[PDB]
């Protein structure tokens, strides 16, 4: 087909347009405004644009030339193709585009109307003629909307390098609705921040609808048991989309790939109640908090409850009623008469959760009495101490906050799942490890990622640091049997660019945050999944 021989790709960038919100991939569709771009600079998009439209590989040229010659019977650079208004949006000092063979479609304008060193063509068949005559690597359609429309309805695009700008702007022109039958996404990049917006890079593909060391690889894999056994009784063919992607570089896939790993390779166990899980042991996930807030996109997540849990912890509280009166039910089941009695806490009042996270963070080692006691200057204020070590001894390898008080375990409603946070400071940035002994991949983890990411931002702010990495170590990583079906749905979804977290900048002590100091901007997500 014409676009496979001449290697004609589209590259574009689309913001969200000003229209319980439904999100699909038509969410990213805004192209330009009043004949320019809807944003000022997004330098990372330019850097990427520059990299795709200028990259050439001379070794691959020999096969492209042959291929092209065969379909015709018979310093290397790429061609870029522009609508006239696209071309007129470009600052003069940057035209023609350096190190690229510039082509401009126009009727109003002819060869004579240009000083530059550009090919002017009347019409699309004129690009195909030209490409049969030029030595060039790849041909990229640079827009705008009219050029994009005509190139897709002529089935002349092999791939779309589509940048998702995860902010909203005023737009007067739009990228056409991509037909899912015609194009599927095969690759999704890492998520970055540039110019106060997150973005990622996705690739749509035209649909179906020394090399002795090649061999040493196979010799060296001689003992591998699983040769399509169905190790666990989940069917790869149900993860069609998940498996069809080639480059899964969105950080959400750090979480998604562990659910794949647990499902394909998990050990079958009957846990605390008889419920049943697949389980694995030891994983690490790293999220770049300077580039995004890793709220999972492949299902809807509300953070009001877990933000109010984090503030409850920081205040040192163990009173389950405080959450209940803010309509947060996170701890309700763990405070019942029955639940407490079955934990042999017969002398513990309903919703008095005992010496849990808050108590240990502000008072580790004090004798716990009841949820209403004044524990001032009793036991160790770990939280205060770790803020003090970040500020005054940032290179310490001893900045840990530990919830696992061995003496108090049996007196807690339940022993903590988030065992400990360690902190690390280099060059004015704060990174955090949280070690989780016990990890519900379907229900718990996605919230836990959020709690500790928010907490790291908070500790960074009050210490006058920027956040860097939030690092999540999973000990006992389990998927409950009755989550599996929901999880196979979620895995076949393709993540959206992460949102961002904004903390009220004025809060300077860790104690001084409230619910209104927390804003999640630009949360684009698939619909909610009931995991059960």
Ligand X SMILES: NC(=O)C1=CN([C@@H]2O[C@H](COP(=O)(O)OP(=O)(O)OC[C@H]3O[C@@H](n4cnc5c(N)ncnc54)[C@H](OP(=O)(O)O)[C@@H]3O)[C@@H](O)[C@H]2O)C=CC1
Ligand Y SMILES: O=c1ccn([C@H]2C[C@H](O)[C@@H](COP(=O)(O)O)O2)c(=O)[nH]1
Ligand Z SMILES: CC1(C)N=C(N)N=C(N)N1OCCCN(Cc1ccccc1)c1ccc(Cl)cc1
Residues annotated as catalytic (active site), given as ranges = 417
User: Applying CB under 6 A, does 403 fall inside the site for ligand Y?
Assistant: no
Annotated binding site for dUMP: 272, 397-398, 417-418, 436-438, 440, 448, 478, 480
User: If you count them, how many residues does the chain have?
Assistant: 532
Question: How far is the C-alpha of 201 from the C-alpha of 96, rounded, in Å?
Answer: 25
Residue 485 touches which of ligand X, ligand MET, ligand Z, none (Cβ within 5-8 Å per kind) = ligand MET
Residue 510, token pair as written in the block: 């860790």
User: Applying CB under 6 A, does 401 fall inside the site for ligand Y?
Assistant: no
User: Applying CB under 6 A, does 297 fall inside the site for ligand Y?
Assistant: no
Report which of 137, 45, 531 is spatially closest to residue 300, judged by C-alpha positions: 531
Residue 44, token pair as written in the block: 């990372």
User: Applying CB under 6 A, does 398 fall inside the site for ligand Y?
Assistant: yes
Residues 406-425 that bind ligand Z (CB under 6 A): none
Number of residues that bind ligand Z (CB under 6 A): 16
Residue 272 touches which of ligand Y, ligand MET, ligand X, none (Cβ within 5-8 Å per kind) = ligand Y
Q: How far is the CB of 120 from ligand X (least distance, A)?
A: 9
Residue 448 touches which of a copy of itself, ligand Y, ligand X, none (Cβ within 5-8 Å per kind) = ligand Y
Q: Could you say which of 189, 448, 486, 522 contacts ligand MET (CB under 6 A)?
A: 486
Question: How far is the C-alpha of 141 from the C-alpha of 179, rounded, in Å?
Answer: 18
- Residues lying near ligand X in the complex (CB under 6 A) are found at 12-13, 31-33, 35-37, 83-86, 89, 105-109, 122-124, 142-147, 150, 173
- 245-248: which pairs have CB atoms within 8 A and are 24 or more residues apart? 245/185, 245/186, 245/187, 245/188, 245/494, 246/186, 246/187, 247/186, 247/187, 247/188, 247/189, 247/203, 248/187, 248/188
Q: Could you say which of 485, 511, 512, 527 contacts ligand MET (CB under 6 A)?
A: 485
Q: How far is the CB of 110 from a copy of itself (least distance, A)?
A: 34
Sign of CA dihedral 243, 248, 250, 251: positive
Residues 95-124 that bind ligand Z (CB under 6 A): 97
User: What is the edge-to-edge ordering of all strands in the sheet holding 400-402?
Assistant: 267-269, 277-288, 466-480, 429-440, 418-426, 400-402
Residues 153-182 that bind ligand Z (CB under 6 A): 163
DSSP string, 237-273: GGGHHHHH-SEE-STHHHHHHHHHHHHHHPEEE--TT
Q: How far is the CB of 100 from a copy of itself (least distance, A)?
A: 15
Residue 210, token pair as written in the block: 């020394």
Residue span 351-390 as binding mask against ligand Y, x where in contact by CB under 6 A, dash where not: ----------------------------------------
Residue 219 touches which of a copy of itself, ligand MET, ligand Z, none (Cβ within 5-8 Å per kind) = a copy of itself
Q: Could you say which of 24, 34, 36, 196 contacts ligand Z (CB under 6 A)?
A: 36
Contacts of 73 (CB under 8 A, 6+ apart): none
**Cα Rg of the chain, angstroms:** 28
């Amino acid at each position: 087909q014409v676009c496979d021989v001449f290697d004609i790709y589209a590259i574009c960038a689309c913001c969200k347009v000003e229209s319980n919100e439904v999100f699909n991939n038509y969410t990213f569709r805004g192209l330009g405004n009043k004949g320019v771009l809807p944003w000022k600079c997004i330098s990372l998009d330019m850097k990427y644009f520059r990299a795709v439209t200028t990259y050439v590989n001379e070794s691959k040229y020999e096969k492209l030339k042959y291929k092209r010659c065969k379909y015709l019977n018979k310093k290397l650079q790429n061609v870029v193709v522009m609508g006239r208004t696209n071309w007129e949006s470009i600052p003069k000092k940057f035209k023609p585009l350096s190190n690229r063979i510039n082509v401009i479609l126009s009727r109003t304008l002819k060869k004579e109307d240009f000083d530059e060193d550009v090919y002017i063509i009347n019409k699309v068949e004129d690009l195909i003629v030209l490409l049969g005559k030029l030595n060039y690597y790849k041909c990229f359609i640079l827009g705008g909307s009219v050029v994009y429309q005509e190139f897709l309805e002529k089935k002349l695009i092999k791939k779309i390098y589509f940048t998702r700008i995860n902010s909203t702007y005023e737009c007067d022109v739009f990228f056409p609705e991509i037909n899912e039958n015609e194009y599927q996404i095969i690759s999704v990049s890492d998520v970055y921040t540039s110019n106060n917006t997150t973005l990622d890079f996705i690739i749509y593909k035209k649909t179906n609808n020394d090399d002795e060391e090649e061999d040493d690889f196979v010799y060296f894999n001689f003992n591998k048991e699983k040769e399509e056994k169905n190790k666990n009784s989940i069917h790869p063919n149900d993860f069609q989309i998940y498996n069809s992607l080639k480059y899964k570089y969105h950080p959400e896939y750090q979480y998604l790939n562990i659910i794949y790993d647990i499902m394909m390779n998990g050990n079958k166990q009957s846990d605390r109640t008889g419920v049943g899980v697949l389980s694995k042991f030891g994983y690490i996930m790293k999220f770049d908090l300077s580039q995004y807030f890793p709220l999972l996109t492949t299902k809807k997540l509300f953070l009001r409850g877990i933000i109010e849990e984090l503030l409850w912890f920081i205040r040192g509280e163990t009173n389950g009623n405080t959450l209940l009166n803010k309509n947060v039910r996170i701890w309700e089941a763990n405070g019942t008469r029955e639940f407490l009695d079955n934990r042999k806490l017969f002398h513990r009042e309903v919703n008095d959760l005992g010496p849990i996270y808050g108590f240990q963070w502000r008072h580790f080692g004090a004798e716990y009495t009841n949820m209403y006691d004044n524990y001032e200057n009793k036991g160790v204020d770990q939280l205060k101490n770790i803020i003090n070590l970040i500020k005054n001894d940032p290179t310490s390898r001893r900045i840990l906050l530990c919830a696992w008080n061995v003496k108090d375990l049996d007196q807690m409603a339940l022993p903590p799942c988030h065992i400990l946070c360690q902190f690390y400071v280099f060059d004015g940035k704060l990174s955090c490890i949280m070690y989780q002994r016990s990890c519900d991949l379907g229900l718990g983890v996605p919230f836990n990622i959020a709690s500790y990411s928010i907490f790291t931002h908070m500790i960074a702010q009050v210490c006058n640091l920027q956040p860097a990495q939030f690092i999540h170590v999973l000990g006992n990583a389990h998927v409950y049997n009755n989550h599996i079906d929901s999880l196979k749905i979620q895995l076949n979804r393709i993540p959206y660019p992460f949102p961002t977290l904004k903390l009220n900048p004025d809060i300077k002590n860790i104690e001084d945050f409230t619910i209104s100091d927390f804003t999640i901007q630009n949360y684009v997500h698939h619909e909610k999944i009931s995991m059960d």
